[PDB]
Amino acid sequence: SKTFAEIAEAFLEPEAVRIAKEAVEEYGDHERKIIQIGIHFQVCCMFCDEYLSTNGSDRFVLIEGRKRGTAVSLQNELCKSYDLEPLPFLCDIFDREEKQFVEIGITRKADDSYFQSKFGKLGNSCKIFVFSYDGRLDKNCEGPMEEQKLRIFSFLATAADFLRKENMFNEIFLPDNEETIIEMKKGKTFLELRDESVPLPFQTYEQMKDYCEKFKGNPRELASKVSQMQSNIKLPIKHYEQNKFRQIRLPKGPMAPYTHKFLMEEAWMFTKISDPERSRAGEILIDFFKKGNLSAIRPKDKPLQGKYPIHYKNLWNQIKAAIADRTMVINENDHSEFLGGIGRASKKIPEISLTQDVITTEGLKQSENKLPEPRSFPRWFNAEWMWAIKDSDLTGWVPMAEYPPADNELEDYAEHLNKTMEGVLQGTNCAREMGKCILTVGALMTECRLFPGKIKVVPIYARSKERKSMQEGLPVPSEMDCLFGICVKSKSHLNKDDGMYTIITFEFSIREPNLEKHQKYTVFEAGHTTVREVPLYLYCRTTALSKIKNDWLSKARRCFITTMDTVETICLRESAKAEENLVEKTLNEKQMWIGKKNGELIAQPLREALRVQLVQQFYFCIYNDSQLEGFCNEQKKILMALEGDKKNKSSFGFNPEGLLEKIEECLINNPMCLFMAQRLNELVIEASKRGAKFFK
Amino acid sequence: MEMGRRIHLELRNRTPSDVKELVLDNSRSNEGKLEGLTDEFEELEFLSTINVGLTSIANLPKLNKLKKLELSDNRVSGGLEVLAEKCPNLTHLNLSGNKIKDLSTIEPLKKLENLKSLDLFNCEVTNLNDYRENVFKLLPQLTYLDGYDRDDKEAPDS
Amino acid sequence: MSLLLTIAKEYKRLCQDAKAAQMMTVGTVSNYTTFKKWTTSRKEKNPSLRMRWAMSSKFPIIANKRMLEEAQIPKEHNNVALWEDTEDVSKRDHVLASASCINYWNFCGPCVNNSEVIKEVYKSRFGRLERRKEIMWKELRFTLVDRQRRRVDTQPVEQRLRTGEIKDLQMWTLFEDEAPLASKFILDNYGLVKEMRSKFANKPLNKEVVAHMLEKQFNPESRFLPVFGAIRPERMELIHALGGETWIQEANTAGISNVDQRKNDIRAVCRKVCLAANASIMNAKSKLVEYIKSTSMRIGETERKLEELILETDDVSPEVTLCKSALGGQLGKTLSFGPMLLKKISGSGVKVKDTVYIQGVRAVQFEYWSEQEEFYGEYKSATALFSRKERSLEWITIGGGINEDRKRLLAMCMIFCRDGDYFKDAPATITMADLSTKLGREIPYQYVMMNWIQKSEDNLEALLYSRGIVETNPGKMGSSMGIDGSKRAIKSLRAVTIQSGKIDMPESKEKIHLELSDNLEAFDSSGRIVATILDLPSDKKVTFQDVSFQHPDLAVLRDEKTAITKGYEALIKRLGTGDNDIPSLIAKKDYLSLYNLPEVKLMAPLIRPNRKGVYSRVARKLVSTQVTTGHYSLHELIKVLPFTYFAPKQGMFEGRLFFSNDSFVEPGVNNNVFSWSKADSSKIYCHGIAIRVPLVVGDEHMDTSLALLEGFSVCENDPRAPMVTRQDLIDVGFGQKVRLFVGQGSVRTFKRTASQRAASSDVNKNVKKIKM
RNA sequence: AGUAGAAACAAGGGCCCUG
């Protein structure tokens, strides 16, 4: 249906299509008229109807489909034989019985214009029948037989339905005799512009068109120009083996500081036996506060480090007062105002109310954008990773759904592998953070949605399940509610997408604070805690969140999919090369290098490197930014070069130094990027012992 | 078609009070429920409803002059006590082709003292042992059964 | 009712305004579509976040108001908010509510009489479940599956139709009062429309949903996917749970929703007609068209015309391609060369003749293209990506899985490109008897060589030997093919690479018109021969079931049953409109005239003369009972009118009405000699021959709006005639004019006289005259 | 105060409303 002929073939018989096509080609007119002319011919045929005369011979003789040359020959032959006067113009059918011609016409408009014009041209000489698509007949003589009318008018109705459906029932496709010249209505201005947008050597669209319509190929000149451009360029080609990749340069300065909202390693938590009835956030916080361990906290005036202590102490006291009243709404005071920035939003000044005097009175200059500053590699990230790769003395940290039934072996295999991986992955500490993020952000999302304009108090909590020992001892292990800390959210009046809303986080600890790492926080020694007794430290941050970070953190559970895919991408591949179920053996045995220790390469099975993969995906969720995006997008080239080195493929490049420059430009104040780059350099170093293409 | 239009068609301007016969065969009735009948039909003496996807008798008005009924090809089951109140002057009934399981459903017909002939063919009840006799002993007034009297006496044409 | 008055008052209020009046008055109704877009324009960037943000709110669902009041749904069942009086800003006829309300409605709301209708609405998905329940899963294994990327269909569908045909199906199964003027398809396939109509009539349903679901029901979802193993819609719908690149879940799915046997039967029939219509040298094409038009076949319950099936099908096979060409159907850009498949990726060329001496000196011209040309190829369980250049095979890369198929593909490809010395100097064995004119038609050299290779394996080995053999260089051992299609050897065919993994099938959504010559040679707007009759199986005998070859030459029955069938056709040919015909006589209760109709007089001799009188009495009686009461079965009337010619007599009626040929018809029960069904009341099966009855008058079973559509026709507009309802069409007199609203925004004039002559015949005849 | 980036937020509209 890409060309008109198919659209005519949809209802018209293909023969009339071919006829009208040949006719259009002979005239040389557009083929858009294949639709009208074909219709004109089919009527004529179905007009004839194979009727006969008194002598048992054919009655009607067609003249239309015939070529132009033979049309006037048959016309004159008939005008002569029956002794008739020759007509000036051509006709469509010659009724023998009545010895007179019959013209046919078809006008879309239900009006007598076409009939009047045709009659005026032909007068009353012969019989004219002006059919219409919507059932109207205009003639100058007796009407045709009933059957002829019924067949013509039914065909025309169907045709008009099938045109109106396709938006082709217009003057364009069905014009009358006069309106046969459609053309873009060229306006004075459009031409004035077209004659101005022409390339330089030409000065009028006419010259450009005349030069382009006749353009001929001269490969000698084209080659000469190509060679002249190939000589004045000197495109550099650099095989890496000769020109090696210098080590990535990392910036210099102070250590990158902790930035994630919720403490992972340090955070100290309080557990309480699960109550199904009281499962709500506020109810859980009330239950935890009532035992009385929480009420012991009484921070000292002087913090170990940090700034703005008094505000934090006041807000902690107000939170405790709130719970006792069982109303988690904070009043607007100086401390909450300063921490929440309720009123530190610049007031817009109109320009019409401006003058040089106002500019002088208060400085006015374009904001001097203070781009980020450079921070050196963090030496503490490895410790967080190693700790996050250990069990948490509990399981069931993150919520997962149930396993459905099974019918075929494939589902049983999928469910066994998933069960093994979920068992491995539910015991770590990273997964504890997955649960803490999902639950805390869910609660904070449902508070900011319901109670904006109220500086609510939301806990930082999670739910878990004590491990399963042997049948000995207490069976049927119980559940547990954990309380890592407490949060609050200043007014979350999120009028627009990707908003901004300051929050504040109090979290417990039993560890001394590092100056370099815990720069963000403002710790407060808080009495003692049992396990024997141990000192306490209350880490009070003032972070900020948005809608998008909330929605995505509440969907950190994605990491399971990616890690599972990678692990089963390795296991199915290893099993296929041997055509046997090799998954358990692959998981238990396959050793995956995960670091160095004492100048040697450590290795551990896959079953324990799933944890490393999971931490990688979780940290990608946490520290995602533009920097990490650009970096992880631009480091692939180096890995591809590594692969080329492994397989003796003589890779090459055009300007690698610029690539390294681009990379080192996007390494700023984001621990993950810097750590990953340092590892990438150590990798290329370790591989240089068994490979090439890298400098020391 | 539909009983409503079918009836309105059969009634060529005739009032529903002077007819003596009616036919509704090869139509459909929503919910297998009659629709359009009332007590206006008084002179009615015959009725025929065949293959209309019928399953019950609940909207049946009161018809006294009715003396012959036909419900073949449907799936009626259970409702047979209305006949003692709406059509007490009934004599001929036919149910071949309907869902009938036991005899307890048939017992009410004893109250139709005007009953003469009954027609049960292709029903589950027919697949029992000594059923013609048990029915005859239940409905003594009856003489003809499925077109055959006791001793297999073929009944006349009409 | 009062609702009607409300609609009229609303229209009045709308017209009282000025702007609404302008927009309604000007133009046609199509503007509605346009107006349907300027309203309710609002999208959202991240829908997930918006939905999660919204759901937290107390009342995240807009809902109807009056329906809630009617259903006695209170605002709070038990200290739980459900809705509050308010108006949605955009709609202005809805009230906010919460999701909890659905649960309440689900557990104690209004209950409908029956919800089994959903099983018909989503018949596709229930079919999916039923098919899935019959799969015996065997055993997961692991191995590197070879997958080929090819276009396939992923939905088993019966009676696949086009978008144009389907649109009428929705209108004619749900909205009949607003149906457009009757199309050809609706008249032809009236059993399907009746079957769909019955299920969804007098039912409480959202009509739009049902229409959309029927649209999906009739759409075979074609996708370009990786594939392994057999190709069947039953598998492709769940291929995701059968195997990937590294694993395979074996399963036996052969006996579910067989869709391949009907495609096979259609191709067999096309082969049979193409081989029949080669006898007429001068007018093979016209004979072919007539042969196709006068044939049909049964699909499930319905009987469909072969011409429409060929148009709908997508079998890219040489048999179907020629037939599609003759009818005028456009088809895919897919060549053929014997039992092989091809697809031109690139290149060009132009015919160039060259001589070949068959034996000693016997010049025979053969045409060869002259340009570089890449070609995908496909033989059974093998594929290739070859290229040619100026009468030379430049290279061929094969990725099949079998040796025999590989050799056959290579040989047919070499032949395709007319490479090798043999084309220069023909083999000694081939003779002039086989060269050409098996039945008076010349056979070019290439097809001669193709037949030669098929005749004997030794010729094939010689041909492959013609291509140079070299020594397998080191390393290339794996990418080499011997004479026995070995994966590797010490000596191998020149420039014949071999690899593992099927060559991915190309794709192109193009439609090329192609004609055909008097010798059934399909040209395609250029020299190329897409297909011919010399690439089909020689011949074979088959017993086709549920098919109708209603043509004299294509018939095996004797003069007796043919005569009876012709007589019944003639009797059904007087069922058309106009006075002195069966329907008009029935309306005038003039049953007596039926006994003297010409066709009964012609058919009377057949009737068994010994007891003609007794049969005549019974059939002459039944008609009266049917005629007088007004309750009649048109089919029984047609069945028993042949017997009403003779004078009644006296005698005992056993039960069957015999002819003079020991064939009877029992009055009421369908049998082979005469059959029909209440489902499809527009077919009469006489000795397994389908006789279409025109739709000029309804019957008690068939009665509906459709059974009269053929009778009516359009005529010159007359404003005097009355404007009637669609239902009253049944009561109008024959040869009486009447105005009628049709479809949307169309008022026409219909006259109850059937005038639908064959259009194809008249055009063909007139056009042939232009060539004299 | 804080977020993050190469600019924006740190409520906005009319004593009252809203994402």
PDB file of all heavy atoms in Angstrom, chain C residues 29 59 221 239 326 343 378 387 490 529 583 632 750 768:
ATOM      1  N   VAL C  29     -18.535  14.631   9.908  1.00  0.00           N
ATOM      2  CA  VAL C  29     -18.415  14.037  11.231  1.00  0.00           C
ATOM      3  C   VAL C  29     -16.977  13.680  11.571  1.00  0.00           C
ATOM      4  O   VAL C  29     -16.629  13.606  12.755  1.00  0.00           O
ATOM      5  CB  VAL C  29     -19.303  12.788  11.342  1.00  0.00           C
ATOM      6  CG1 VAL C  29     -20.741  13.137  11.065  1.00  0.00           C
ATOM      7  CG2 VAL C  29     -18.840  11.723  10.387  1.00  0.00           C
ATOM      8  N   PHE C  59      -6.953   9.521  48.913  1.00  0.00           N
ATOM      9  CA  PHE C  59      -7.942   9.213  47.875  1.00  0.00           C
ATOM     10  C   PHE C  59      -7.315   9.337  46.494  1.00  0.00           C
ATOM     11  O   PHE C  59      -7.425  10.375  45.832  1.00  0.00           O
ATOM     12  CB  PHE C  59      -9.151  10.142  47.988  1.00  0.00           C
ATOM     13  CG  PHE C  59      -9.851  10.067  49.307  1.00  0.00           C
ATOM     14  CD1 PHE C  59      -9.869  11.160  50.149  1.00  0.00           C
ATOM     15  CD2 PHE C  59     -10.505   8.916  49.698  1.00  0.00           C
ATOM     16  CE1 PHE C  59     -10.512  11.103  51.361  1.00  0.00           C
ATOM     17  CE2 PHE C  59     -11.151   8.856  50.913  1.00  0.00           C
ATOM     18  CZ  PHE C  59     -11.155   9.951  51.743  1.00  0.00           C
ATOM     19  N   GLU C 221       0.903 -12.073  15.664  1.00  0.00           N
ATOM     20  CA  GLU C 221       2.009 -11.217  16.070  1.00  0.00           C
ATOM     21  C   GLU C 221       3.294 -11.702  15.420  1.00  0.00           C
ATOM     22  O   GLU C 221       3.842 -12.739  15.803  1.00  0.00           O
ATOM     23  CB  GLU C 221       2.128 -11.214  17.589  1.00  0.00           C
ATOM     24  CG  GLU C 221       0.908 -10.656  18.295  1.00  0.00           C
ATOM     25  CD  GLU C 221       0.881 -10.989  19.775  1.00  0.00           C
ATOM     26  OE1 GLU C 221       1.954 -11.291  20.341  1.00  0.00           O
ATOM     27  OE2 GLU C 221      -0.214 -10.946  20.374  1.00  0.00           O
ATOM     28  N   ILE C 239       8.620 -19.803  23.693  1.00  0.00           N
ATOM     29  CA  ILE C 239      10.015 -20.144  23.426  1.00  0.00           C
ATOM     30  C   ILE C 239      10.911 -19.741  24.587  1.00  0.00           C
ATOM     31  O   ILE C 239      11.912 -20.408  24.872  1.00  0.00           O
ATOM     32  CB  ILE C 239      10.467 -19.493  22.107  1.00  0.00           C
ATOM     33  CG1 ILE C 239      11.783 -20.100  21.638  1.00  0.00           C
ATOM     34  CG2 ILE C 239      10.604 -18.004  22.273  1.00  0.00           C
ATOM     35  CD1 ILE C 239      11.635 -21.460  21.024  1.00  0.00           C
ATOM     36  N   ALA C 326      -1.371 -13.872 -10.171  1.00  0.00           N
ATOM     37  CA  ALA C 326      -2.505 -13.863 -11.089  1.00  0.00           C
ATOM     38  C   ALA C 326      -3.661 -13.045 -10.530  1.00  0.00           C
ATOM     39  O   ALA C 326      -4.288 -12.263 -11.253  1.00  0.00           O
ATOM     40  CB  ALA C 326      -2.960 -15.290 -11.379  1.00  0.00           C
ATOM     41  N   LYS C 343      17.533 -14.654  -1.327  1.00  0.00           N
ATOM     42  CA  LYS C 343      17.210 -13.268  -0.994  1.00  0.00           C
ATOM     43  C   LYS C 343      18.383 -12.372  -1.379  1.00  0.00           C
ATOM     44  O   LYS C 343      19.467 -12.492  -0.800  1.00  0.00           O
ATOM     45  CB  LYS C 343      16.877 -13.138   0.480  1.00  0.00           C
ATOM     46  CG  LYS C 343      15.434 -13.462   0.801  1.00  0.00           C
ATOM     47  CD  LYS C 343      15.015 -12.904   2.156  1.00  0.00           C
ATOM     48  CE  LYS C 343      13.751 -12.055   2.078  1.00  0.00           C
ATOM     49  NZ  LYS C 343      13.851 -10.810   2.887  1.00  0.00           N
ATOM     50  N   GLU C 378      18.867 -20.679   1.310  1.00  0.00           N
ATOM     51  CA  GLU C 378      18.251 -21.506   2.348  1.00  0.00           C
ATOM     52  C   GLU C 378      17.716 -22.790   1.726  1.00  0.00           C
ATOM     53  O   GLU C 378      16.711 -22.767   1.005  1.00  0.00           O
ATOM     54  CB  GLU C 378      17.146 -20.756   3.077  1.00  0.00           C
ATOM     55  CG  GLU C 378      16.540 -21.548   4.226  1.00  0.00           C
ATOM     56  CD  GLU C 378      16.079 -20.667   5.376  1.00  0.00           C
ATOM     57  OE1 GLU C 378      15.799 -19.473   5.140  1.00  0.00           O
ATOM     58  OE2 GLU C 378      15.993 -21.169   6.516  1.00  0.00           O
ATOM     59  N   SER C 387      28.054 -15.108  -3.245  1.00  0.00           N
ATOM     60  CA  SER C 387      28.123 -13.946  -4.116  1.00  0.00           C
ATOM     61  C   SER C 387      28.578 -14.390  -5.494  1.00  0.00           C
ATOM     62  O   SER C 387      29.362 -15.331  -5.631  1.00  0.00           O
ATOM     63  CB  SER C 387      29.072 -12.878  -3.568  1.00  0.00           C
ATOM     64  OG  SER C 387      29.681 -12.153  -4.618  1.00  0.00           O
ATOM     65  N   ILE C 490      42.040 -32.973   3.628  1.00  0.00           N
ATOM     66  CA  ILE C 490      43.353 -32.615   3.105  1.00  0.00           C
ATOM     67  C   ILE C 490      43.234 -31.878   1.775  1.00  0.00           C
ATOM     68  O   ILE C 490      44.098 -31.061   1.439  1.00  0.00           O
ATOM     69  CB  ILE C 490      44.229 -33.873   2.972  1.00  0.00           C
ATOM     70  CG1 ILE C 490      45.653 -33.497   2.548  1.00  0.00           C
ATOM     71  CG2 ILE C 490      43.614 -34.867   1.987  1.00  0.00           C
ATOM     72  CD1 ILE C 490      46.400 -32.686   3.583  1.00  0.00           C
ATOM     73  N   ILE C 529      13.353 -13.707 -12.953  1.00  0.00           N
ATOM     74  CA  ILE C 529      12.305 -14.717 -12.886  1.00  0.00           C
ATOM     75  C   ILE C 529      12.196 -15.131 -11.424  1.00  0.00           C
ATOM     76  O   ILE C 529      12.997 -15.928 -10.930  1.00  0.00           O
ATOM     77  CB  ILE C 529      12.603 -15.907 -13.799  1.00  0.00           C
ATOM     78  CG1 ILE C 529      12.782 -15.428 -15.239  1.00  0.00           C
ATOM     79  CG2 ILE C 529      11.494 -16.924 -13.709  1.00  0.00           C
ATOM     80  CD1 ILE C 529      14.223 -15.285 -15.653  1.00  0.00           C
ATOM     81  N   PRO C 583     -39.676 -16.189  -2.766  1.00  0.00           N
ATOM     82  CA  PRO C 583     -40.025 -15.322  -1.627  1.00  0.00           C
ATOM     83  C   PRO C 583     -41.295 -14.513  -1.828  1.00  0.00           C
ATOM     84  O   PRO C 583     -42.122 -14.428  -0.910  1.00  0.00           O
ATOM     85  CB  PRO C 583     -38.792 -14.423  -1.471  1.00  0.00           C
ATOM     86  CG  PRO C 583     -37.920 -14.681  -2.637  1.00  0.00           C
ATOM     87  CD  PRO C 583     -38.588 -15.621  -3.568  1.00  0.00           C
ATOM     88  N   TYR C 632     -41.934 -21.342   8.648  1.00  0.00           N
ATOM     89  CA  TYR C 632     -41.417 -22.208   7.603  1.00  0.00           C
ATOM     90  C   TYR C 632     -39.908 -22.320   7.730  1.00  0.00           C
ATOM     91  O   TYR C 632     -39.252 -21.479   8.349  1.00  0.00           O
ATOM     92  CB  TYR C 632     -41.793 -21.686   6.212  1.00  0.00           C
ATOM     93  CG  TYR C 632     -41.404 -20.249   5.965  1.00  0.00           C
ATOM     94  CD1 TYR C 632     -40.160 -19.923   5.455  1.00  0.00           C
ATOM     95  CD2 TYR C 632     -42.287 -19.217   6.243  1.00  0.00           C
ATOM     96  CE1 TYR C 632     -39.804 -18.610   5.228  1.00  0.00           C
ATOM     97  CE2 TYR C 632     -41.939 -17.902   6.017  1.00  0.00           C
ATOM     98  CZ  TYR C 632     -40.697 -17.605   5.512  1.00  0.00           C
ATOM     99  OH  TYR C 632     -40.348 -16.296   5.288  1.00  0.00           O
ATOM    100  N   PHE C 750     -32.500   2.981  -0.745  1.00  0.00           N
ATOM    101  CA  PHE C 750     -32.354   1.565  -1.026  1.00  0.00           C
ATOM    102  C   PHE C 750     -33.606   1.039  -1.706  1.00  0.00           C
ATOM    103  O   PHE C 750     -34.729   1.368  -1.308  1.00  0.00           O
ATOM    104  CB  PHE C 750     -32.111   0.776   0.255  1.00  0.00           C
ATOM    105  CG  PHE C 750     -30.763   0.993   0.858  1.00  0.00           C
ATOM    106  CD1 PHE C 750     -30.383   2.239   1.299  1.00  0.00           C
ATOM    107  CD2 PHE C 750     -29.892  -0.063   1.021  1.00  0.00           C
ATOM    108  CE1 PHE C 750     -29.150   2.434   1.865  1.00  0.00           C
ATOM    109  CE2 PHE C 750     -28.661   0.127   1.588  1.00  0.00           C
ATOM    110  CZ  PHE C 750     -28.288   1.375   2.009  1.00  0.00           C
ATOM    111  N   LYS C 768     -10.568  -7.158 -23.351  1.00  0.00           N
ATOM    112  CA  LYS C 768     -10.084  -8.020 -24.425  1.00  0.00           C
ATOM    113  C   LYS C 768     -10.470  -7.464 -25.790  1.00  0.00           C
ATOM    114  O   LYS C 768      -9.690  -7.544 -26.745  1.00  0.00           O
ATOM    115  CB  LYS C 768     -10.626  -9.439 -24.264  1.00  0.00           C
ATOM    116  CG  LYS C 768      -9.848 -10.291 -23.278  1.00  0.00           C
ATOM    117  CD  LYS C 768     -10.390 -11.709 -23.212  1.00  0.00           C
ATOM    118  CE  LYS C 768     -11.764 -11.770 -22.570  1.00  0.00           C
ATOM    119  NZ  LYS C 768     -12.295 -13.158 -22.541  1.00  0.00           N
TER     120      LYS C 768
END
